[PDB]
Structure formats: structure tokens, C-alpha cells
């Protein structure tokens, strides 16, 4: 029950309850998705309707985001109304009704729409395939619900029981007086939550290498590579991502995107090559694999990768910072590959 | 939907006289039909009032 | 009257140099007096479409010609309602007044006629 | 929450904030797409693109600087973000690109490579971004043959016929000193920045003023971009809104908050305290809609935009929406106004105070260029809370009631009725 904060002379505050319940720690496929979609529905004392109607008159909104690791219940509002939102978030975590009709009428439809939006973007279909092959069952768990395996109202309830505990969540209010925040948190239902265990395992995920997957898709073609990084070797990949996505690298205009997903026990580096026709996708990635195999860096973007990693003001609790000013060279060992789109006209792991 | 469309009686009026899609180019020669309905009304109304005094 | 029939008669006249030199000039003058070209239309745009043959034909028309027919028809209605003609430079030229829908119509009529023939074929033993 | 602004030879505007992690510096010119012509339309967007060209961008990346630019209607901006310590190195790159390299960026190899990119950029926009495409055409018809009609990204035909000389001609007529403001946001002090600026002299084209034009005007009209191959219908409809620095600037923005925005797929959105939702959800008249109060130097637009797959009921969508707007003149309630105040503050706050200095720069720059100062967030709230039902009614009775409208749409809009039918709904029959 870590209660962070940080005051300021601004008028908008933002409470947030991070909870370790993303797809990483999911009992059944998409259950974390359904629960995230179930947040802010009916509680035992306040209906979803009233919550919205009340918060609107006060001047604040709610939102529940899903990660591969987290489930964040954020609440943006006007500074002085702090107590209300603390108890609102408390209510959701402690007593959401979970009515069968809420499932069929609001949760399932909203989730079906989520899966539909993602089912049409080839990069995301790839990013999912990347996780599934590297981490064959940990972070490689399906992010969204798609119905491959049954998920009853009970399963969503059981999962909420495991994940919603004092020992598995962290309150974090931006632009809030830590004094009053800690006071209200303990004066609410947060402290009444049955503090269970934390599933944040320190042991490095057993990732695989030299794995590839090909998915036929109608639309833009996309070839992507994924590399499992170490807990300490992640700072170099961070500069690599910002190097490949900058005017410094010549091959920046040959890729669509490149990033490093930072977790609590490691990470994953991703590189995306997307284009209409398969010919341009084949050449552009085949060139990248060749240029990166004969890797180089010399740390020219040492200040740039440190500048770009600083604009992320919501991440003022980030891991290592000065690890950048150390290593300055990069190679390219074994990685994972995924071909999405015009498969019959796309490169294989071999010819790379 | 608008009441003129949902009501059982008004929808008839709406589909025939309000929202009825007309070809943009019809000329004044297409005004004779309404004139015929008007004629029918004038004949009926005047005839009933006269019938009141006719043997 | 079917287009197959109009084609039969029309082609017979077009092949014979006797009739071809006698009729065509008359037909050309008839077409100019018709005036549809001053509205931006091609003759084929004028064919009554509320029948299965014409629907089959319009369905088979390639996209580009379809969008073009649509613009010409809409432009004609707007001009007609304003009681004007298009500026001379916008009129359809004789080179453009091509029977673009005719081949699709003839093909559909033949297909239709064959079905009618086959549905009524007698058999002799 | 400090708005400091002083003038020496150039007008410097800053807004310091202790905790920030980064600092953004840039110059904002008092001229945008509204200053262009129908023929050189897209020159400003072109400038932005070379300023972010691989060459100029790599020079800043080595130094550890990030580039950002924004082309609007009334203004234009070039911003460089840096760490709080390199607040001086951003100014070196700024001057080096606007005086030294104001001839090196315009090379025949760089220009052609950039032109080829903005062409595929503007083309992609017209081919796929339907909601913004429609909103852009809304400005085009609403303000036809007037400055605000020109699209920010420029048109394909004016772009491909553009040359290096056009860039120069525009730059020498608008990138002047009297038509500029140096802005600094992040954490750096006002006195910290003004010194580094007043250090390096040299005026460079001082006393020179930009060319004048004709005042913008709203014309009730429409542009229909029918396309039956698109899976939806996207429409935008609006009346002449409020210009920035208008007494009703806030009354208008509040009025738009009353109807707000909507998303049929988001459970929470379907629950908002908006009366219009009772009408549109029964037969699901749309996938989404959003009201807005766009304000510019000379004028503005107040209306809404919407997207829908219910192509046979578009007339009900428009009808119910316009009946609700009629209410603003005759029956808007106290609680609707109060709900709007609270939500307007929340949104106005989330905009003015984000964790990104580049947004702050654009907001600060755009304001000081028009009114010579920036209204503090706390000052706005005082004005917002002071609005009464009587204010909204007086405003609506002048801007919405029986007033001309402007319409734009694309996709399957066969069901969008004629102009006069829509226009008639801008009022109600009464005894
Ligand atoms: C002993 C027997 C006596 C004879 C009895 C007569 C029979 C009476 C019974 C019925 C009479 C009422 C019916 C009226 C409509 C009949 C005519 C008609 O439909 O013609 C349409 C026909 C279609 O016109 P259009 O292409 O759609 O109009 C384009 C307009 O410029 C589009 O322009 P616009 O919409 O902007 O305005 C159009 C026009 C519309 O004016 C109208 O009200 C309708 C058009 C009628 C024109 C003249 C009708 C003469 C009837 C006799 O308004 C005008 O400004 C025109 C006024 C011209 C004179 C009208 C007569 C004044 C009489 C003084 C009393 O108009 C004509 O060409 C008129 C032909 C006249 C010969 C008629 C032959 C039958 C006799
Ligand atoms: C048979 C002989 C009958 C002769 C009697 C002639 C009728 C008198 C015409 C006077 C028209 C009076 C009027 O202003 O009617 C208005 C209604 C309004 O129709 P609206 O569609 O709701 O309005 C749009 C135009 N506004 C009202 C915004 C200006 O528009 C109407 O409803 C007019 C339709 C009248 C049909 C008769
Ligand atoms: C004489 C009118 C008697 C109406 C009954 C009153 C009543 O009691 O009407 C009750 C209905 C309620 O119906 P509702 O739609 O609200 O449904 C209930 C909830 N879903 O109101 C109406 O129909 C009002 C309609 C008034 C217009 C009447 C005449 C329309 C003129 C053109 C006629 C077209 C028909 C032609 C047929 C050949
Ligand atoms: C479309 C309908 C009608 C037509 C075309 C029509 C036509 C006529 C004609 C031609 C006459 C003789 C006019 C004359 O005096 O020279 C007449 C007379 C008469 N009609 Fe009709 N009529 C119609 C409907 C009606 C109706 C519904 C009544 C209702 C009772 C009616 C009642 C009479 C009467 C009472 C007379 C005798 C008075 C008179 O001469 O005008 N008519 N009608
Ligand atoms: C697609 O094309 C169209 C179109 O569809 C329509 C509808 C119209 C519009 C025109 C019309 C709808 C005309 C319709 C007319 C009729 C249906 C007339 C029917 C006739 C009647 C006589 C009605 C019956 C009347 C009565 C019972 C009343 C008489 C008696 C009374 C008042 C009682 C008197 C006694 C006492 C004691 C007071 C168009 O113009 C048109 O093309 C442009």
C-alpha cells in the first residue's frame, strides 16, 4: 500500500490506483481485459449512472486503462474535491456489484469493440505475436478477450479477488498534498481491503530466441523483430530505440516504429516495418537486419535518448537513469521475427 | 425518430407530402395532380352545401 | 423494341452503300435536333433503365464509366431545372457520343433470349 | 502560474514552472495559412517540413535537442525542446536556422525531397482522414474567398507548383521581427532567457511590416463530398462563432460543453448528463459526435461534427441535435449550465496544464500574439463561474436562433437533407 504524491500550485489533480493485474498475471484469456472493462460499472451503493452524473457536476472524470502488467484506475479532477475521488476509487476496488446483466449489456460489447479495433491494426497483431513467442506464457498472454476459452461472471469475480488487494496495489496522486492523501486513503475502504500477496516476481521471465511466426492478413504488410532484454542491459536498447527513431540513423525512414517496453523484471525491444506492398517491406527489414548485425553506435544520441526519456513526466519513478552514460556499442544477436500481411511475399528468419 | 415518422397516421402524411423524394427537375407540368385533388375538394364541398337546398 | 432488333436494322442500313449514304445524314441531323448533347448527355444515358436487361447492363459497367454516367445525369437535371443549356464548350462532341452501354445490353439480351429458348426446347424421338 | 512578458527589441514571452524536467524554446510568428493566397497555399506547411528535415533535425539530435513545429490559421511556430541545462544551446540552433541556414535548408536536394514528402502527406490526408478532411472543408465553405478558408496543409495543386522562391518571398514578408514573439516554456526563468537574447544583438529586417488584406466573413453555405464507397457519413455543421478576445468567448465555449462529445461504444459516455442522448441512443443515430467553439483572430465557428453508419436516419440525427440547440435560446436549465461550468474547467485545465511544455508554448504564443498577454487559468475560472442562464440565452438568441449555417460532409450522405431543411431547424414555430 505505497501512497505516493507530489503537490503543485496547479488547479487539476489526478489520483491513480495502479494494480498489478494486467495480462501478465491472468488466470484465463482476456479476464484482465473484462475486469478492466468492468471497472466503474455498478457498485453496491452507487450506480455507474450516478457516479458519472455526480462527478460531472463536481468537475472530474474516471478512466480504467489496461497494460500487459497493470490495471490503472485513474481519476482526473479539480484539486479541492480530493476526498470524493479517493472514496469512489475505493468503492470500485472493494464492492463492484458484478451483475450478470451488466456483463451482457455493457462489458462484453465494450470488450468486443476493443478487440475489433485492435484486430484491424497489423502492427498490434504483430506486437501480440511477438510477446507470445518470446515469453511463451508469461507476458506472452493475450492482452484482450476474444472468446477462445470460456470466461464466466464468476471467473471475473475470482480474478478481482486475487488482484484487488492492499499488497498488490499502489495509490499514486499527482498534484496532491501527500498529507491529506495518506489520511484519506487510510480513512477510506482501501485499508479495509484484504491485503493478499504481490505477484511481482523478480526472477527473469524465461524468454525464447530464434522464434518466428507468420500471419496472413488483408491490408498493410508488416515485418517485425522482438528482442528480450536484461534487467541491466535495457538502458542500451533504450538509446537504440531512440537512435532508430531519429534523424541520426540513416535507416530511420525505413521503419515505422521502434521502442523498448520497460517492465519490473526485464523488457522487450520491438522494431516495426509497415508498408502497403510486400516488396518494400522485404527490402527495408532485410537491410535493417544486415546493418544491425554489423552494429554500431558510438553514443551520438546519448543526450538525445536522455532528453526523450525525460519528456515522460508521468514516469517520475523510472528505473536506472545514469546507465546510459556507460555502454556505447551495439551488435545484434538472436531475435524473434513475425511476418504479417502478404506472407507469400515476405522474408523468413533464414534470409535475414 | 421524429414524431411525424413514428406516429401511425402522421407517417402516411410524412411519406406522401413531407419527405417524399422528388426528382429535382420536375417542371410546372407536374403541378396538375395537386390541382386535380383541389378540384375534387371544391366539387364535393360546394355540392354538399347545395344538396342541403336541393329537391 | 429490343436493341438486338435495332442493331439488325441499323447494321443492314450501315453496310449497304445505297442506304448508308441516304440515311446517315438524315440521322445525324435528327441527333443534333434532339438536343441531348447540349445538356451534356450521351444517347446511352437516355435509355429507360427500369427493366432487368438495363439493370444487368448497368451492373456490369466498369466503375469509371459508371461514375461518369452519374455525373452527366446529375449535371443534366440541374441544367434542366435552371432552364438553360450548358456553355457550348461543355457540350458532348460527336466523337464522345459513343454507344458505351450498347455492348453490355446486347450481351444481356442474347443471354436472356437463350434462356427463353432453352426453357422451351422441344424434343423429338 | 506566472505569465511574464517583456519587450526590448523583440517581444519575449515566458511561463516558468519549477518541476518540469525539460524546457522548450521557440519563435512564434503572427502569420499562418490565413495569410497565404489560393496559389501559394501550403508554403507555411512546407516551411515546417524542411525545418524538421533529416538534415536540420540530425544537427539538433547530435546536440541532444528535439524539434517541433505547428502550422495554424492565425499563427505559425518553430519549437526546440531541451534539458533545463541546455537552455542556451536551443537559442544557438534557433538563430543558426533562421539567419545562418536560412539559405542552406533551401538546397535543391533537400527541397525536392521534402516537397515529395508533403505531397504524399497531404494526399494521404485527403484520402483517409475523413473527419478532419470534413472539418477543413467546413472552414473552406464557411469562409470562402476569405483568409480563414485556406487549409493549413495547403492544397495538392498549389503545393506541387511551389518553388524555393515562394518560400523566400513568404519568409521575407512574414518571418519579420514585428510579426514575431520568442516563447519559452518549461522551467527556465524569464530573466534567464531574456539575457541570452538581449546578449546577441543584430536586428535583421527591423521596421519592416507584413502585408495587409481583407477581413474574414462567414457565408451560410455547404459543400457535399458524397462518396458512397465509404462505410460511414461524416458531417460537420456550424454557425458563425466567436473570435478570440470576444466578450462571449467563454459563453460560447460553455454552450458547446452543454452538448459535449459522445462515443457510442464507451459505456461511460452513454451515461452523461446530456438530454440529446435520450433521443440519439434509441435507434443509435451515430457512432460519435463532438461540439466545438473554434475561435480565431477575426472570427470563429460554433457547431458540431459527427460520424455515423445509420445512413437512413441521418435526418433524425440532424433534427434532434438542432432541436436541442434551439433550447439554448428558450429553455436551457440552471443545472445544465452548472454541469457545463464544471466540465469546461476540467477540460480547460487539462489543456493549459499538461505535462508537455511544447503544448504550453503554442498556447502561450498564440495568445500573446493576439492580445499582447495571456489570461491566467485562475482568471478564466472566474469568468466561467460568472456565466448565468441569461447570458447563454442572450448569446444563443444572437448566434444560433434563425441564423445561417455552414455544412460539409463526405461518405454516404444521400440521407443528409437539403440546406433549407437543415436551416429551418435553427428555430421553432410559436404563437
Ligand atoms: C375560353 C378559355 C379560357 C382559357 C382558360 C385557361 C385554363 C385555366 C385552367 C388552369 C389554369 C391554372 C393552371 C396554371 C398552370 C398551367 C400552365 C402550365 O403548367 O405551364 C407550365 C409550363 C412549364 O413551365 P416551366 O418550364 O416549368 O417554367 C419555368 C419557369 O420560368 C420557372 O419559373 P418560376 O418558378 O420562378 O416562376 C414561374 C412562373 C409560374 O407562373 C405560374 O403561376 C405557373 C406557370 C403558368 C404560365 C402561364 C399559364 C397560362 C394559363 C392559361 O411565374 C412567373 O413569373 C410566370 C408568369 C407568366 C404569366 C402567368 C399568367 C398571368 C395571367 C394573368 C391573370 O409553363 C409554360 O410553358 C406555360 C405554357 C402556357 C401555355 C399553356 C397551354 C394550355 C392553355
Ligand atoms: C388549398 C389552398 C390553401 C391555401 C392556404 C395557403 C397556406 C398559407 C401559406 C402561408 C405560409 C405560412 C408559413 O410561414 O408557414 C410556415 C410553415 C413552416 O414550415 P417549416 O418547414 O416548419 O419552416 C420552415 C420555414 N420557416 C418556418 C422556418 C420560415 O410552412 C407550412 O406549413 C406551409 C405549408 C402550407 C400548406 C397549405
Ligand atoms: C381524427 C384523428 C383521431 C386521432 C385519434 C386520437 C388519439 O387518441 O391519438 C392517439 C395517438 C397516440 O399514438 P402514438 O403515436 O403517440 O403512440 C403511442 C405511444 N407509442 O396520437 C396520434 O395519433 C396523434 C395523431 C394526430 C393526427 C391525426 C390525423 C392526421 C391527419 C392525416 C390522416 C392520415 C390518415 C389517412 C388514413 C386513410
Ligand atoms: C367531382 C365531383 C363532381 C363533379 C364533376 C360535379 C359536376 C356537376 C355538374 C356538371 C353539375 C351541373 C352544373 C350546372 O348547374 O350546370 C352538377 C350539379 C350538382 N351537383 Fe355536382 N359534381 C360533383 C360532385 C358533387 C357532390 C359530392 C355533390 C353532393 C351532393 C353534388 C351535388 C350537386 C347538386 C346538388 C347539383 C345541382 C346544382 C347545380 O346545378 O349546380 N355534386 N355537378
Ligand atoms: C410523388 O408525387 C406527388 C405526391 O405523391 C403528392 C402526394 C403530391 C401532393 C398532392 C396531393 C396529395 C393531392 C391529394 C388529394 C386528395 C387525396 C383528395 C381526396 C379527396 C377528398 C374529397 C377528401 C374527402 C373530404 C371530405 C369528407 C370533406 C368534405 C365535407 C365537409 C367539410 C363537411 C361539410 C359539412 C358541414 C355541416 C360543416 C404531389 O404533388 C406529387 O407530385 C409533385
Swiss-Prot record, chain A:
One of its GO terms (cellular component) is respiratory chain complex III. Its main location: mitochondrion. It comes from the Eukaryota. Keywords: Electron transport, Membrane, Mitochondrion, Mitochondrion inner membrane, Phosphoprotein, Respiratory chain, Transit peptide, Transport. One of its GO terms (molecular function) is metal ion binding. The modification Phosphoserine is found at residues 125, 152. SUPFAM superfamilies: LuxS/MPP-like metallohydrolase. One of its GO terms (biological process) is proteolysis. It is a peripheral membrane protein. Pfam families: Peptidase_M16. It is found in: Mitochondrion inner membrane. Component of the ubiquinol-cytochrome c oxidoreductase, a multisubunit transmembrane complex that is part of the mitochondrial electron transport chain which drives oxidative phosphorylation. Component of the ubiquinol-cytochrome c oxidoreductase (cytochrome b-c1 complex, complex III, CIII), a multisubunit enzyme composed of 10 subunits. The complex is composed of 3 respiratory subunits cytochrome b (COB), cytochrome c1 (CYT1) and Rieske protein (RIP1), 2 core protein subunits COR1 and QCR2, and 5 low-molecular weight protein subunits QCR6, QCR7, QCR8, QCR9 and QCR10. Belongs to the peptidase M16 family. UQCRC2/QCR2 subfamily. Present with 35700 molecules/cell in log phase SD medium. This is Cytochrome b-c1 complex subunit 2, mitochondrial. It comes from Saccharomyces cerevisiae (strain ATCC 204508 / S288c).
Curated annotation (Swiss-Prot), chain B:
It is found in: Mitochondrion inner membrane. A ubiquinone binds at residue 16. The chain crosses the membrane at residues 28-51. It comes from the Eukaryota. Residues 1-27 are mitochondrial matrix. Component of the ubiquinol-cytochrome c oxidoreductase (cytochrome b-c1 complex, complex III, CIII), a multisubunit enzyme composed of 10 subunits. The complex is composed of 3 respiratory subunits cytochrome b (COB), cytochrome c1 (CYT1) and Rieske protein (RIP1), 2 core protein subunits COR1 and QCR2, and 5 low-molecular weight protein subunits QCR6, QCR7, QCR8, QCR9 and QCR10. Belongs to the cytochrome b family. Component of the ubiquinol-cytochrome c oxidoreductase, a multisubunit transmembrane complex that is part of the mitochondrial electron transport chain which drives oxidative phosphorylation. Heme 1 (or BL or b562) is low-potential and absorbs at about 562 nm, and heme 2 (or BH or b566) is high-potential and absorbs at about 566 nm. This is Cytochrome b. The chain holds residues 1 to 55 of 385 of the full protein.
From Swiss-Prot, chain C:
The keyword Electron transport applies. It is found in: Mitochondrion inner membrane. GO terms for biological process: aerobic respiration; cellular respiration; mitochondrial electron transport, ubiquinol to cytochrome c; mitochondrial respiratory chain complex III assembly; proton transmembrane transport. The keyword Magnesium does not apply. It is a peripheral membrane protein. Gene3D superfamilies: Cytochrome b-c1 complex subunit 7. Present with 10100 molecules/cell in log phase SD medium. Component of the ubiquinol-cytochrome c oxidoreductase (cytochrome b-c1 complex, complex III, CIII), a multisubunit enzyme composed of 10 subunits. The complex is composed of 3 respiratory subunits cytochrome b (COB), cytochrome c1 (CYT1) and Rieske protein (RIP1), 2 core protein subunits COR1 and QCR2, and 5 low-molecular weight protein subunits QCR6, QCR7, QCR8, QCR9 and QCR10. Belongs to the UQCRB/QCR7 family. This is Cytochrome b-c1 complex subunit 7, mitochondrial. It comes from Saccharomyces cerevisiae (strain ATCC 204508 / S288c).
Curated annotation (Swiss-Prot), chain D:
The keyword Transport applies. InterPro entries: Metalloenz_LuxS/M16, MPP/UQCRC_Complex, Pept_M16_N, Peptidase_M16_C. Keywords: Electron transport, Membrane, Mitochondrion, Mitochondrion inner membrane, Respiratory chain, Transit peptide, Transport. Pfam families: Peptidase_M16, Peptidase_M16_C. GO terms for molecular function: metal ion binding; metalloendopeptidase activity. One of its GO terms (cellular component) is mitochondrion. It is found in: Mitochondrion inner membrane. It is a peripheral membrane protein. One of its GO terms (biological process) is aerobic respiration. Gene3D superfamilies: Metalloenzyme, LuxS/M16 peptidase-like. Disulfide bonds: none annotated. Belongs to the peptidase M16 family. UQCRC1/QCR1 subfamily. Present with 19300 molecules/cell in log phase SD medium. Component of the ubiquinol-cytochrome c oxidoreductase, a multisubunit transmembrane complex that is part of the mitochondrial electron transport chain which drives oxidative phosphorylation. Component of the ubiquinol-cytochrome c oxidoreductase (cytochrome b-c1 complex, complex III, CIII), a multisubunit enzyme composed of 10 subunits. The complex is composed of 3 respiratory subunits cytochrome b (COB), cytochrome c1 (CYT1) and Rieske protein (RIP1), 2 core protein subunits COR1 and QCR2, and 5 low-molecular weight protein subunits QCR6, QCR7, QCR8, QCR9 and QCR10. This is Cytochrome b-c1 complex subunit 1, mitochondrial. The gene is COR1.
Amino acid at each position: 500500500l505505497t501512497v505516493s504524491a507530489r503537490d503543485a500550485p496547479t488547479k487539476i489533480s489526478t489520483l491513480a490506483v495502479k494494480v498489478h493485474g494486467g495480462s501478465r498475471y491472468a488466470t484465463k484469456d482476456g479476464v484482465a481485459h473484462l475486469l478492466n472493462r468492468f471497472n466503474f460499472q455498478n457498485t453496491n451503493t452507487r450506480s455507474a449512472l450516478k457516479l458519472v452524473r455526480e462527478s460531472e457536476l463536481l468537475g472530474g472524470t474516471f478512466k480504467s486503462t489496461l497494460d500487459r502488467e497493470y490495471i490503472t484506475l485513474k481519476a482526473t479532477f479539480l484539486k479541492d474535491d480530493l476526498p470524493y475521488y479517493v472514496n469512489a476509487l475505493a468503492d470500485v476496488l472493494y464492492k463492484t456489484a458484478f451483475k450478470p446483466h451488466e456483463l451482457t449489456e455493457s462489458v462484453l460489447p465494450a470488450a468486443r469493440y476493443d478487440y475489433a479495433v485492435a484486430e484491424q491494426c497489423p502492427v498490434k497483431s504483430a506486437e501480440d505475436q511477438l510477446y507470445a513467442i518470446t515469453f511463451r506464457k508469461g507476458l506472452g498472454n493475450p492482452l484482450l478477450y476474444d472468446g477462445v476459452e470460456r470466461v464466466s461472471l464468476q471467473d471475473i469475480k475470482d480474478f478481482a479477488d486475487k488482484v484487488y488487494t492492499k499488497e498488490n496495489l499502489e495509490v499514486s496522486g499527482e498534484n496532491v498534498v501527500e498529507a491529506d492523501l495518506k489520511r484519506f486513503v487510510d480513512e477510506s475502504l482501501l485499508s479495509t481491503l484484504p491485503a493478499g500477496k504481490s505477484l511481482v516476481s523478480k526472477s527473469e521471465p524465461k524468454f525464447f530466441l530464434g522464434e518466428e511466426n507468420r500471419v496472413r492478413f488483408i491490408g498493410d504488410s508488416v515485418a517485425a523483430i522482438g528482442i528480450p532484454v536484461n534487467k541491466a542491459s535495457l538502458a542500451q536498447y533504450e538509446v537504440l530505440a531512440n537512435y532508430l527513431t531519429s534523424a541520426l540513423s540513416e535507416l530511420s525512414g525505413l521503419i515505422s516504429s521502434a521502442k523498448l517496453d520497460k517492465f519490473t523484471d526485464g523488457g522487450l525491444f520491438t522494431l516495426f516495418v509497415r508498408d502497403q506492398d510486400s516488396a518494400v517491406v522485404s527490402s527495408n527489414i532485410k537491410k535493417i537486419v544486415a546493418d544491425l548485425k554489423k552494429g554500431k553506435d558510438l553514443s551520438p544520441a546519448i543526450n538525445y535518448t536522455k532528453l526523450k526519456n525525460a519528456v515522460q513526466n508521468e514516469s517520475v519513478s523510472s528505473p536506472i537513469e545514469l546507465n546510459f552514460d556507460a555502454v556505447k556499442d551495439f551488435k545484434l544477436g538472436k531475435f524473434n521475427y513475425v511476418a504479417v500481411g502478404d506472407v507469400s511475399n515476405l522474408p523468413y528468419l533464414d534470409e535475414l | 425518430m421524429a414524431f411525424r415518422k413514428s406516429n401511425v397516421y402522421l407517417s402516411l402524411v410524412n411519406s406522401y407530402i413531407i419527405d417524399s423524394p422528388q426528382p429535382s427537375s420536375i417542371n410546372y407540368w407536374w403541378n396538375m395532380g395537386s390541382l386535380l385533388g383541389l378540384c375534387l375538394v371544391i366539387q364535393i364541398v360546394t355540392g354538399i352545401f347545395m344538396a342541403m337546398h336541393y329537391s | 423494341q429490343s436493341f438486338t432488333s435495332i442493331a439488325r436494322i441499323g447494321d443492314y442500313i450501315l453496310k449497304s452503300p445505297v442506304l448508308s449514304k441516304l440515311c446517315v445524314p438524315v440521322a445525324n441531323q435528327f441527333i443534333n435536333l434532339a438536343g441531348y448533347k447540349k445538356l451534356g448527355l450521351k444517347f446511352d444515358d437516355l435509355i429507360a433503365e427500369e427493366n432487368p436487361i438495363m439493370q444487368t447492363a448497368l451492373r456490369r459497367l466498369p466503375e469509371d464509366e459508371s461514375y461518369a454516367r452519374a455525373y452527366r445525369i446529375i449535371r443534366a437535371h440541374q441544367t434542366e431545372l435552371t432552364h438553360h443549356l450548358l456553355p457550348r464548350n461543355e457540350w458532348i462532341k460527336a466523337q464522345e457520343d459513343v454507344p458505351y452501354l450498347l455492348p453490355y445490353i446486347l450481351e444481356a439480351e442474347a443471354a436472356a433470349k437463350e434462356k427463353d429458348e432453352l426453357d422451351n426446347i422441344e424434343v423429338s424421338k | 502560474a506566472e505569465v511574464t512578458q517583456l519587450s526590448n527589441g523583440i517581444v519575449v514571452a515566458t511561463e516558468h514552472n519549477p518541476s518540469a524536467h525539460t524546457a522548450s524554446v521557440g519563435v512564434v510568428f503572427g502569420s499562418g495559412a490565413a495569410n497565404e493566397n489560393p496559389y501559394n497555399n501550403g508554403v507555411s506547411n512546407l516551411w515546417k517540413n524542411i525545418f524538421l528535415s533529416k538534415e536540420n533535425s540530425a544537427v539538433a539530435a547530435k546536440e541532444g535537442l528535439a524539434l517541433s513545429s505547428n502550422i495554424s490559421r492565425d499563427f505559425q511556430s518553430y519549437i526546440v525542446s531541451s534539458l533545463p541545462g541546455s537552455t542556451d544551446k536551443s537559442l544557438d540552433f534557433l538563430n543558426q536556422s533562421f539567419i545562418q541556414q536560412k539559405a542552406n535548408l533551401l538546397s535543391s536536394s533537400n527541397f525536392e525531397a521534402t516537397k515529395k514528402s508533403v505531397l504524399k502527406q497531404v494526399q494521404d490526408f485527403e484520402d483517409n482522414d475523413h473527419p478532419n478532411r470534413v472539418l477543413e472543408h467546413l472552414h473552406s465553405t464557411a469562409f470562402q474567398n476569405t483568409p480563414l478558408s485556406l487549409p493549413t496543409r495547403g492544397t495538392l495543386e498549389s503545393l506541387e507548383n511551389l518553388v524555393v522562391a515562394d518560400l523566400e518571398s513568404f519568409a521575407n514578408n512574414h518571418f519579420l521581427n514585428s510579426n514575431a514573439v520568442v516563447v519559452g516554456t518549461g522551467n527556465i526563468k524569464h530573466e534567464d532567457l531574456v539575457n541570452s537574447i538581449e546578449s546577441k544583438n543584430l536586428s535583421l529586417q527591423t521596421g519592416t511590416k507584413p502585408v495587409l488584406k481583407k477581413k474574414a466573413a462567414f457565408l451560410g453555405s455547404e459543400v457535399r463530398l458524397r462518396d458512397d464507397t465509404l462505410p460511414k457519413a461524416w458531417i460537420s455543421l456550424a454557425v458563425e462563432g466567436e473570435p478570440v478576445n470576444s466578450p462571449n468567448y467563454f459563453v460560447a465555449k460553455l454552450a458547446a460543453q452543454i452538448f459535449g462529445s459522445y462515443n457510442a461504444f464507451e459505456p461511460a459516455s452513454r451515461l452523461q448528463g446530456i438530454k440529446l442522448l435520450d433521443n440519439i441512443q434509441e435507434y443509435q443515430l451515430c457512432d460519435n459526435f463532438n461540439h466545438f467553439s473554434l475561435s480565431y483572430k477575426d472570427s470563429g465557428l460554433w457547431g458540431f461534427s459527427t460520424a455515423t453508419r445509420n445512413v437512413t436516419m441521418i435526418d433524425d440525427l440532424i433534427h434532434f441535435t438542432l432541436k436541442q440547440w434551439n433550447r439554448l435560446t428558450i429553455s436551457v436549465t440552471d443545472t445544465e449550465v452548472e454541469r457545463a461550468k464544471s466540465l469546461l474547467k476540467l477540460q480547460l485545465g487539462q489543456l493549459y496544464e499538461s505535462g508537455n511544455p511544447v503544448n504550453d508554448a503554442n498556447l502561450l504564443g498564440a495568445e500573446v500574439l493576439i492580445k499582447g498577454s495571456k489570461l491566467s487559468l485562475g482568471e478564466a475560472f472566474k469568468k466561467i463561474d460568472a456565466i448565468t442562464v441569461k447570458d447563454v440565452k442572450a448569446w444563443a438568441g444572437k448566434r444560433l436562433w434563425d441564423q445561417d449555417i455552414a455544412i460539409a460532409g463526405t461518405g454516404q450522405i444521400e440521407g443528409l437533407l437539403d440546406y433549407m431543411r437543415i436551416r429551418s431547424d435553427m428555430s421553432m414555430m410559436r404563437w
